[PDB]
């Protein structure tokens, strides 16, 4: 579970807070107009007094994150998203000096629900993956040189819900294949294809309507006889004459 | 190190299971493993060689992967692969060789080369696999700690030693008594001679003894013990102990009497055999003691009586002997033997590249010198160096 | 039995292919097989020992499984596994050893121990896999029954035998004619001597012959045949046939004349070689017959003429000889040879644990005694016991 | 094994840091660790004993836990705890002792008892902690293969040896020349005597030498070297080499001339000191060589001249000597020394419970016998057994 | 400096308290401390070596941190850590050693190496902790200044001195009176001899005295004082004071009369003992004065009377002596003793790396030379160097 953690220090050992404050407790001095230090330090103190409480904040998050987190299957490497998420220091500031002996946590029922979801999702991702792979590989040893590209990919993403394809850079969808076409295959999936191929031939000729090619001899040739058809012209063996796929 | 191993069984189980035809299904579990490697690699740069007359080739990587497509290999697939393997082959060679020469007193049991010191790195471990090659199997078990073990045919445990000890001698060397022997490899031949044919000896019997101390314990040894020492059954002119003159040995052979072979371990008798010739088992020992006697024949036909007079000159010298050969055995330490090419590989690579004598191994990797003073440092270096030779022989012979 | 086998290639192909790194894929087909085992086991109590100095360790089974929820094996994965293997290792050892001693006349070809009698059980057969270990490969083929077979370097087919036969002798032993030999392991040396140098023999030629009957047929034998028997080329004082006195042998060697080696099978000549020294092939035989002659030199320089007078005393004894060594061969029955440790393993385990002499094997598993009277019971027990030793050596050396 | 360790520092850092008074916060990090244990245990059964006069006690588990409540510790809290510890104390004792007697040849190192074989189990590992006890610190590093290490005062490296060597002697023993010594523990005393006071010796100087080969290398040794061997400075009546008679030694002491001490490692001089008495450092050696001479005084007052006549009888025997003591040193192998109680603990537990002599250790754990033939098996067993003794001494002295 | 310390107890209390399985909580206070370090480091570069056969290795940093809210540590956690510690280990070694050879005079009491001069830097002080290692405990207190001190067994306060002083002598050396002694380490043996047995001495008593001035004050000394000097109780041939001839000493021992031992401090008697043999305490002294007398026996049996005639020749030389050993003591200055390996560590590292003689320490760190002229500079350098040796021994022995 790659779930980037953080200082036990931060955790509840909190002090960082106590130090964040002590460092503040000695910033009260000259340089420019008076309407300045006055206003400035006065604000600072409101952090100090509240510090007793600000402590509590650290604890809170510490736990919560440290809790919720647990129930996450979806690994999580740290990446530089392409989108932000605006955060007005406005609210920040409020939360800060504005919290008292409050104490809340995740309702049991709440937690599960969380697990459950990531779960499903995961399962879907993983599963479709297999569903995906299986197909593509088959797609190659079948010489179905055609769809292989998009076709499969499209369905794939759709079933994953989450994103609306379309706005997927073309470099992405294909690159997606490039990665997929390099994995094993749920024994289940795989184990079956191996089966179909082995019998494949047998089915095809074993059908009523349709047979494999014909031969030309321009040589008054002798018709054969077979119980099931009577007097007919078959020949289960083409050998001795070129073959033209 | 373990890293190194993989790099090979990778290629062998590769250059072997990949040919025009075969179904993909015989390599799915294989292909994968392979690729994984390529990735970890390319991007990192290497340097090999320098010391002695050994070229310094620099190596870069950035090779595309494979296909999981075709479920029936087409010739074209092979060639585009063999061309990528032949860079790893010609590589590894230059890699083995580089760490197959550097020695270190202090901690000369671990990696040395700028090539390998970088391999033991962590970001590489992502490869290790199929450790069924007798040698690696043993390298690991040694890292953790456990009853290791190897298998040898005609092992090379005895440093060459060919000498004699005169228990009774005089300036003229006309009435000697003593033993002469040859300890070499897996064989011992020892003869006890008494020019007087025990004429004045108590019970007309002269006792002999030959003790050989192994530098390493051998276990599960299958041994051939035969009476007589053919090597010391013919006339010889030998240098005296002080090198000042030469004496004459004119043997006549009698059966060794009261033969007793003891295989001891730390002074304790583990196996003892009384006059048993043929095949015997010595299960655990660090010392062999051969005791045998010359007993003057109590009854002699005229022709025999004539060889053994009551007074000097003693012209026919009564001799009894034994021959002992260790056909196979197990040793917890690496050793040279009559089948493995390890010693020869290491010695050969060093000789070919004019590698200077180092601080650990005797000049020329001389076996006798090595086994005579088989220090812990020499053994650790020898094992490292033998294990590398074995990794190399999986691809290059 | 076959059961037993798996238990190992299981662990080897395990303790070998499972290490910090590799991609799951390499072991998917492996992991599975493994688990399957654990299941079948857990819950069954096992007892080992109860004889001589053999501890009686009891074993319980309650072990977890192996998640398949990973790609690259993290160190943590290994250790939690090695700890579970080290119970099977230290187990199997105590298992092999237990059935590597008991013997049974009636059904010696079968299992004995309270440990194994329970293994042949049906509910366990759910394991068996990868039977490519030369020995098991042969165990199986022997129960359905067919052309079984093994490989041996310098095999051990000849029970030790060192003796002579005087075809012409007299009390003084001053004019003897006969042969002396040493048959041991894979080698035969035989010399024919005629004190009179065929002075009164028809065509001045004395015929000699040495026949050796193998206890088992050897096929595909590569053999070295050389003229002369070095072992019988030196002066000796030997005990008379009745042990009442000693005779003198003072050989002078001549080339063996009209050498003919026959490798016979059931009385039929399968291979015959006339005076061919060097490497020869004997493809299927149960008997070797060496015929050779001493022919008095028709022309002699003075020095030679002086050795062979028309009348006694005969002081230089004309001797001709042959040396034959079986380098390699195939046998349908297990045998000791110069490379395999089987005999030594079995003999060593029995010696270490002070196992009492049983009803089948000679005291000390003595090879000469065993091969001399190689009964069907001894062979079936030997094969069972050798196969177990080979299973054990896959893990413990 | 490592398991075992914890079980103790658990109790010590327990029976010690827990008393009527202190605040919870001083043990919060401790209490926790503790409980964790209890859990893992309860439900599991153990048995110990069954060898000699050693009882066979059976133990079961299902104990409560501990209040994470209270701010301060009230007496009542202690007692309800001590009562639960005293079962673990009286337990561990019976545990250590059980695995402190069983010895083995093959894997003489690993566990042995039905008590411990179950501890190395995986489900227990959840206990290990605070491994600063010098011995465990070293046990681990050894399982990983690293430059280990111990500390000893007056170490016990020399097996007891008290003897002499007469380089010149005659039946009357009235004009002897040779050396006599005592090697024992960490000390060596050696004297060289020459009854003739080098009257006919080249340069009127008699050379002496004493070589002592350690069974294990000692590093970082602080050594006291002093001239004279007080032990051999007084009149003695000694048995002759053959035990047939007694000789008289009447020493008069002279200063040892050209004293040279060499501390060698594998034949190489690592440290050499010429006539330096007092404190010297020998940093790494497996052999000590002491060379010293007796030089006839070139100038003698009448009283001195009278002791050394030109002709026999020689009534005052010129003697020179040296004394060497290893005060402290480091050894990579466990050894007995003058401060640690390990050897005494192991020897004492075995003696008290009438433990039968086993296959590894000499009768009575005799130190001289042990160090004389300090095989790998004896060392592995000794280390296991010494480490357990040290774990035990943390709680029971 | 203090910096350095931490770097270790960091690793020990690390490579020890961090094992497979331990509950988290008992390390929380630890993990933290650890990380803090890593940070401060990564970024800054270091230089090691550059003198003699001292390698010159370079170092860099950038290692991931450590987890926090876990529970029980999984094997995988360890290995990814041990690999990061083994760089600090192999580092510190190369660090200690570098500053364990450099010496300065003006200010040879402080840091020297390009490695350490950078450590005392301020941005580093962010680490110091757990200073319970006897040596650092004392380093600090010395920095701030105060009653420092250490603990020693058989301390090494007396430079080797073995000599004599003839208070009455003559050319023939047939009627001498004086003292001879051996001061070495923690022991003093002194004998007073009077060839005339005080025949013409006032009250038939000859007074003797031996004074030994310590180079440093010893406090809280436990001392063994015994009558007799065994070292000077046997016959000797000694060189004359001018080296021109040799005299004969033939002692006969009498009990020392009116024994008085004074332990003085700056000329003042701190402790005085009159004829008290056994264990005595000397609480603070820089000088020991031993006074004792030889009193001619007023009543003598014939055998005794015969040894002491009224006129020369005096053939039996009356001798009285004392032996004093300092078993333990405290000193405010570092000293070598019989248990600590500091001197040996420093001396050994310098010898192994062929470190050239410097301006402060005598060649070879010779103890006698060092303690004889124990200047302030030598003591400050010795303490720095001993403290570093002790820091090193916490990790590397």
Describe this structure in words.
The structure is cut from a larger assembly and holds one copy of chain A (245 residues) and four copies of chain B (397 residues). Chain A is an all-alpha fold. Chain A has helices at 8-11, 16-22, 34-68, 89-97, 108-140, 150-159, 170-180, 187-205, and strands at residues 224-226, 230-232. Chain A has a two-stranded antiparallel sheet. Chain B folds into two domains: 1-158 and 329-397, Viral capsid alpha domain (Orthogonal Bundle), CATH 1.10.1350.10; 159-328, Jelly Rolls (Sandwich). Chain B is built from eight helices and 14 strands. Chain B has helices spanning 2-15, 28-41, 75-99, 134-144, 302-305, 342-352, 367-372, 376-392; strands at 46-50, 54-59, 150-153, 158-168, 177-185, 187-194, 205-227, 236-239, 246-249, 251-253, 257-265, 268-274, 278-295, 317-331. In chain B, strands 3, 4, 5, 6, 7, 10, 11, 12, 13 and 14 form a ten-stranded mixed β-sheet that branches. A two-stranded antiparallel ribbon of chain B has the order 1-2. In chain B, α1 (2-15) runs antiparallel to α3. The longest helix of chain B has 25 residues, at 75-99. Chain B is elongated. The A-E interface holds A 5-9, 11, 13, 66 and E 28, 31-32, 67-69. Chains B, C, D, E: Homotrimer. Interacts with the inner capsid protein VP2. Interacts with the outer capsid glycoprotein VP7. Interacts with the outer capsid protein VP5*. Chains B, C, D, E: Keywords: Calcium, Capsid protein, Intermediate capsid protein, Metal-binding, Ubl conjugation, Virion, Zinc. Chains B, C, D, E: Zn(2+) binds at residue 153. Chains B, C, D, E: Residues 62-73 are annotated as: Interaction with the inner capsid protein VP2.
Topology:
The structure is cut from a larger assembly and holds one copy of chain A (245 residues) and four copies of chain B (397 residues).
Chain A (H helix, E strand, L loop, with lengths): L7 H4 L4 H7 L11 H35 L20 H9 L10 H33 L9 H10 L10 H11 L6 H19 L18 E3 L3 E3 L13
Antiparallel strand pairs in A: 1-2
Helix pairs in contact in A: 2-3, 5-6
Chain B lengths: L1 H14 L12 H14 L4 E5 L3 E6 L15 H25 L34 H11 L5 E4 L4 E11 L8 E9 L1 E8 L10 E23 L8 E4 L6 E4 L1 E3 L3 E9 L2 E7 L3 E18 L6 H4 L11 E15 L10 H11 L14 H6 L3 H17 L5
Parallel strand pairs in B: 10-14
Antiparallel strand pairs in B: 1-2, 3-14, 4-5, 5-6, 6-14, 7-13, 7-14, 8-9, 11-12, 11-13
Helix pairs in contact in B: 1-3, 3-8, 6-8
